[PDB]
Structures are given as C-alpha cells and as structure tokens.
Ligand binder design. Structure first.
Ligand SMILES: CC(=O)N[C@H]1[C@H]([C@H](O)[C@H](O)CO)O[C@](O)(C(=O)O)C[C@@H]1O
Length: 308
C-alpha cells in the first residue's frame, strides 16, 4: 500500500484490544480507499509497551497502545492514574485525562516530548487478583508471591497490601503461574480470559484495585506524513474503535465471573476497606516524591464526580 503501517501491542490475538485494533485497521483501509493498510503485531512481538512507545517516538512503529498511567515513566505525577483506589471509575478516568488542567498538559507533553499523538481513549478494564489459594481477606495477601508488570504503581499495590511482588513481562506470566513460580497475578477479567490465566489459577478475588484506560497512539513521524484527509480517516477510525473497545470491556465485566465459575474458578469478595486503608501511606509517599505537581494532580482528580 501507499502507507504500510504497523500497530504493536502486548495483548494477544484472543483479546478485546486486538479485536478493536482489527476494527480500526479495517475502517482505515476502507475509508482511505486502500491507501493505508495497518498490520497488527500482538503478543509483545516488538517488545513491551515501554519499547513500543520508544518506537513510536523514533518513528519505526506507527501505532500502539498505552495507559495514561504509563506516562509516569516520564512525568512522575502521572502515577495518579494508577494509584490504587484513587480513580473511581472510567467516567473519572475520561475526565481526568481530557477535562483537567493536569490531563490536558499531559496530552501536550506526550506530543512535544514523546513524539506521540493521542487519537482516542478507551476503557481496558478494572484489575482483579487471581491466585493459587483463596484470598478471603487482606490477611491472605501476606507473603503471596504476586506477579506484577514492570510498573511502579502495580509494585506498590503489591507491597502495600503485604504481598511479595515479582515484576515480569506479560508474555512470561502464564508459565510463571503454571509452574507456581509465583502464586498470583493481577489484571482485568478480560485479560484473565484472553491469556487463559483461568487455566492455571483456581481463585479470583474482586480487589477492584486499579482502573485501566487505553490510549490509541500514533507516531508523530507517521501522522505528519499523512495528508489531512487521511489524518481525519485515522482519527475518526480511532474514535470509533475506542467506543467499541470500551463496550467490549463493559459487557465482559457483566458476565465473565459466570464464565470463570464454569471453568472451575472460585470467586471471592474480600472486604476492601483494609485494602484501601493500606494505600494511605502510599498516597503520602507519592505526594512526598512528586511534590506540588502530584498534590495538584490528585486534587484535580479527587474533585471529579464519578456519576455520569
Ligand atoms: C497498553 C498495555 O501494554 N497494557 C499492558 C499493561 C501495562 O503495561 C501495565 O498496566 C503498565 O502500564 O500490563 C498488562 O496488564 C500486564 O502486563 O499485566 C498487560 C497489558 O496489555
């Protein structure tokens, strides 16, 4: 094609993210009259999300996914998106990004400093905790060997609830769980399904601890080469795909617990009051580390009403 473009992702071929990227790819090809074709590179083939963001910056990858929280790698205050229990729901995540001074500035920095244009935002689920033993209460976390992604906020979740974290790439998790090298992991229900972690985890606890969004990002190096009519095709397709993406997640959260029960998983509902209480020293550490910019981001986000 005139523009042979590439979209990389950690998510695999059975995932919601991939299904929505397929919708995006198909719409772009159709509405560009074949000028643009987007090929998908799932399952971390190109590296992880940190690697893929560098490739968008350099212009060697055209599209990728990232959470708003992942930008904590560059702007420490952006950890606010994934401080456990701070963002209440997806309504709040949307307004945090687009309707706060903090979020608007973050979007501008991503363009100026990181070489990426934000096309759309979707919901990617609320993270839960799977394990090889029941989590009936916060006590059951103590010493649990909990795999985390290589992200500070997930590491802190694990630390502050009393678990023993092991960071590792998404691609390595299934084997770690299968072999009981670790005792558990944490991800939204849709990922537990997509990765088939239910095959190798007997328990699932509704910890509801971190809310993931998902940004459709394009390399500025690529986006600047597309004539404006094709920029609009791409932008409009990303917005349409994001709405679909969100719906996939919302619908799964309604019935995936029954799916997991049919696969033999035992579901628990630990009291979350101690889980929330356990994060209070972490929020204080965040404020100490990130200073006024972090205090401000927190205040801006805490001000958002969660009801539509
Ligand atoms: C956009 C993206 O790659 N998201 C990935 C996230 C983030 O890397 C992590 O939450 C830090 O932001 O990690 C996973 O949930 C995980 O490894 O368990 C896989 C998911 O596909």
């Amino acid at each position: 094609a005139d523009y042979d473009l590439k979209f990389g992702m950690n998510a695999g071929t059975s995932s919601n993210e991939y299904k929505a990227a397929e919708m995006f790819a198909k719409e772009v090809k159709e509405k560009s009259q074949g000028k643009i074709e987007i090929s998908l590179y799932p399952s971390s083939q190109l590296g992880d999300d940190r690697a893929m963001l560098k490739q968008l910056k350099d212009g060697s990858l055209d599209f990728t996914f990232a959470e708003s929280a992942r930008f904590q790698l560059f702007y420490p205050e952006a950890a606010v998106f994934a401080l456990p229990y701070v963002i209440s729901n997806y309504n709040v995540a949307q307004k945090a990004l687009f309707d706060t001074e903090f979020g608007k500035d973050l979007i501008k920095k991503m363009d100026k400093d990181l070489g990426v244009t934000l096309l759309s935002q979707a919901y990617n689920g609320t993270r839960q905790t799977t394990s090889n033993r029941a989590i009936n209460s916060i006590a059951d976390m103590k010493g649990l060997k909990l795999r985390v992604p290589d992200a500070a906020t997930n590491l802190a979740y694990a630390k502050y609830v009393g678990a023993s974290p092991t960071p590792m790439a998404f691609s390595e998790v299934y084997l770690a769980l299968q072999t009981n090298a670790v005792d558990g992991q944490e991800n939204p229900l849709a990922a537990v399904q997509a990765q088939k972690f239910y095959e190798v985890q007997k328990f699932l606890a509704m910890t509801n601890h971190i809310l993931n969004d998902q940004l459709y990002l394009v390399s500025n190096e690529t986006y600047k080469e597309l004539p404006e009519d094709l920029q609009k095709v791409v932008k409009d397709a990303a917005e349409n795909a994001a709405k679909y993406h969100t719906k996939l997640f919302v619908d799964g959260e309604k019935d995936l617990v029954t799916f997991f029960e049919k696969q033999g998983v035992k579901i628990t509902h630990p009291d979350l009051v101690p889980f929330k209480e356990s994060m209070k020293p972490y929020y204080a550490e965040f404020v100490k580390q990130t200073g006024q910019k972090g205090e401000s981001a927190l205040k801006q986000i805490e001000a958002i009403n969660p009801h539509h």
